[PDB]
Design a protein around this nucleic acid. Sequence first.
RNA 1: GGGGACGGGUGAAACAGGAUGAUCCCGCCGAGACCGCCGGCCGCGCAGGCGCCUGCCAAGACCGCCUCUGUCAAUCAAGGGCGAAGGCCGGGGGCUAGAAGGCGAUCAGACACCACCGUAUUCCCGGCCGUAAACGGUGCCGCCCCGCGGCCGGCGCGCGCGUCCCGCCGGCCGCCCAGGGAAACCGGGAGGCUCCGGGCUCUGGGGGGAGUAUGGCCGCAAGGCUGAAACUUGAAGGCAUU
Lengths: 25, 229, 62, 197, 97, 100, 126, 91
Amino acid sequence: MRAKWAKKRMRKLKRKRRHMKARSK
Amino acid sequence: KKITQRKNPDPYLKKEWYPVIAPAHFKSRHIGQTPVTKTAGLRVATDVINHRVYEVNLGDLNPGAEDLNGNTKFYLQTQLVSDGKCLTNFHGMDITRHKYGSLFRKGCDCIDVFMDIPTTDGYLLRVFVIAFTDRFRFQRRKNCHVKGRVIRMMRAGIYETLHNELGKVSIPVLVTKLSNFEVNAKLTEALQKITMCRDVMIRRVKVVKRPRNTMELLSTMHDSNQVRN
Amino acid sequence: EPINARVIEVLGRTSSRGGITQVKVEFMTGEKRQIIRNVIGPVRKDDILVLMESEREARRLR
Amino acid sequence: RGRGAPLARVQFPNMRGEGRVNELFIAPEGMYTGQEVFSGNKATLHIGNILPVGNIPEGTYVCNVEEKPMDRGCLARASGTYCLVVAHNMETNKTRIRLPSGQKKLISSKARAMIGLVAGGGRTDKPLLKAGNAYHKYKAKRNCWPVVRGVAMNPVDHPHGGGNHQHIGVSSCVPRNAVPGQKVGLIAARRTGCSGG
Amino acid sequence: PVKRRNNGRSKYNCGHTNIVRCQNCHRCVPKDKVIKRFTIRNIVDNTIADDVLNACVIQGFAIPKLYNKVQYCVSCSIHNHIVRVRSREDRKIRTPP
Amino acid sequence: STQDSISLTLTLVVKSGKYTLGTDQAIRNIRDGKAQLVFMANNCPPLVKSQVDYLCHLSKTPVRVFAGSSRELGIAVGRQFNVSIMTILEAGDADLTSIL
Amino acid sequence: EAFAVCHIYAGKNDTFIHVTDLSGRETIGRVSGGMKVKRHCDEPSAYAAMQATQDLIEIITDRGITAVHIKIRADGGTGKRVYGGGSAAGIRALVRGGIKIGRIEDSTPIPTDRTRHKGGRRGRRL
Amino acid sequence: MAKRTKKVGLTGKYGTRYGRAARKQLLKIETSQKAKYTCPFCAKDKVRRTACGIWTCRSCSKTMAGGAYSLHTEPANAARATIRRLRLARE
RNA sequence: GGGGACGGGUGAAACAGGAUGAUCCCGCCGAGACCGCCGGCCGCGCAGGCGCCUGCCAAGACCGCCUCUGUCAAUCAAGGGCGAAGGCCGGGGGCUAGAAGGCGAUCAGACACCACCGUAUUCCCGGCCGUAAACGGUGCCGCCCCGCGGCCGGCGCGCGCGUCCCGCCGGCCGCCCAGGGAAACCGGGAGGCUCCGGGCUCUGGGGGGAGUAUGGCCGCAAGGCUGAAACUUGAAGGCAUU
């Protein structure tokens, strides 16, 4: 299911950006 | 038995066979003979065959009609062994799988009730009873399903008839009544009055409570044909 | 033991190549039971087959 | 003082003489003051009653079970703990029970047990939270708390002892045949480590 | 393209039905979608039936019939040829073939 | 699986009928032979039950037990308090609570 | 005549023949397709069953079981419910062997509402 | 009212200490321990804990054995039923 | 307890099980799950969903009526409730399957599909969470609209008279003439529409970027809800034909 697997991959990037911001904060 | 009079295979070289006798209600009382190791003295051969459950078709037990009696099996567990012959006591009955599968048909309603019945002999036997609905003799609809009222009335009837017919019965009486099947016929008269039923029969009876010291029952049910009327 | 059993009818050959014919065999030497028996080789009705292991019946069920 | 499970003073009549005798029993949950508790071979299966394990039916939760007949109490005595009757061999006069650990023990059918689950159930679910709450629990028990790790102690005091960094040195696993001052870490460990199941 | 008005299922006036299992695939299928064939075939083969009837020492014996409801998933059923792909017009046609 | 009087008639007695809630007024009513039926509760204390059952025997007064709970006999009478025993002195209608 | 219970069970992976004492508490013969075969694949096959019954027939005759009551069974439970390849062989051998019958019956365990079966909701995806 | 918005209802005493997991667990145990339970005799919600395992109904004046933090524990409720079913079955 | 060498498993295998006697048979014994065949162009519920005995507790449509009220209505931001599964916080439980993991095989490599083992989970209670191809992929309240049948729930018309017939039906449905559409197909509407207007609320405006960025709100988390722009680009897409 490429779209299901693509949503999962955006989620991971969203977490990485959200967590990276906290380290920068 | 081929050990006491014959060499037999190595384990069966020391295993005698003792006959099992069914209760007096049945016209032919020989279910078979049971192999048991000859007593080594640590274990009495009789106590190994003191409790042993058998499954015997009613068609065999009362020979003759197989159209009726053929699809009913009676569980018969020795609760005693006397003069070698292991006298057997009622352990319940069960309709054969062949009959059960035939009864179910699509397009009909199945009504099935269970009822624990107390015995004057101290036994408690669950009675499992079944019913099916039938298309009317001149009915336009293919479907044989009935309405909730009739379903409630059917269920009430099975419980009432079971209590009326078997409310105070004793184990010997219950066996004879089950062999006659009028218990199924008694169900039919009431059930027919509300609606046409494909089949109303006791599928199985289960011995939920058994009195200890069933010696009196073994004498009444098995020992005397006169006591069995 | 070898048994004598003749063909009753020569049914259409299976085997995925059409090689093995289907034949029905009645043990003319005994109870005549017409069990089906698969046959490899050219056959015509009334050709006796001497084998009849009798531990096998052919499958022609579709 | 040192037991989590509540106890119970049950007064029986004196059979030997004319007074009344008082027994101290670990209390099954549900027992109440002014209950009538029957200890006998002919005792009904109600919580609190003490009957021989052969009489007790299979699947029954039992506690304060006797390891051997007339031992007056041994297994299943802590809060919440219970044993269950698994099977009775009436030829060997023995009954299988499952100890709270899970281990299955064949005990004499003669051995007695109190019907029920010991009270105080779910006592360790609450976090101690503070060191102070621990000191209060241990003061009612024995001087075992507070605990200093052996890697904290100097070489003399413990085999784990001490170096420039706090390390166990050799493997913590010790043989079952260690010597009395050498058995200090994981004794006879069949396996170590966190795992599935 | 909606291939079927039924949508492959006979759920009508419903939102959820009992799950069943393909008898070969062991997969969870909605009860309405499952093949649901029924077989009343007897226990022993027709040939063995004559041999067994002669052998039986009880009079009035008849071979017991065996009753089962075979439920197969779409993929399981089409592969073992229980049902078959039908022509656009023949898909609309119903009735046992 | 497998109340016309146990719930509805208790309400009908309350609507029309003389009922006395409580043990104290019940004992005095059995003593005077003024109680039609006595309705105890499962929670009723064992001593106060055995005496109420003895008095009921000398006073030939039927005694039955509610399905359970003094608290749930109160809920049935529409009261907000526990009712260990209720004496019905006059009934509005129907008595299957007696159940023979 | 004399009877026993044959308790034949055939399922995928093997066929089991077990003549008994009519109570089930005692046994006379337990031969299986695997004992008479060399191929794991051919344990459920009819020819392995045919040979295994032949060997079983000799022990039952020695213990003098003249007739038997068949209780043909399939794996049943949460799967199967259909007999295997050798289940007809074990009856055909007795009737050809001349062991009399008189009670052929079905003893497949059938669930009255079952637990869960192994496979997953997408099922055995082979 | 609602002086503590979150589940620091009984755990406000601990303040900013012990970690969220301990305080959450203590909420459930503490609320259960100081709760009033219904006495199986008084039938009044007056049962309160005296010690771990000991519960007394103030009106019924009856002490009963119980779970450390609840008058009745789930394992016990099941056991009473199993013992009742087995007892009724034996007789 | 018996009796005896394999048992399993498969597409064929292999790993585990078995002379401390397995498998197999019967007798029991205990847990936990599940309610089979009846079980459906059946029904019910606001959807999600709903099946042992179904006691007893409140409800809900429908039909019937010369009962009552007298516009008390329709749809709806804001606001509330409910919401499959998976998950989550914390107990209870724990049989069966089984996300993880481990192991056989299979391959060039599978660490995948297929065995076998198995943690979380699956079940119960107390909270979260707020999503599903949550789909009739079709909002709701109306008005009319042609035939041909089926099913279920009431109610009447008759008739010898049967769960028969005929209506009225309230829903669940199949097929379809017109009519509609790009067509597939709908026709109990997707009809009455370029001859375009009953009422109401929501949503879309070529494709990506992007459900991203940022701010908010909500959640314990996982996340959910709201929601761009720079920039890039000639198709993407529907239904049909060969």
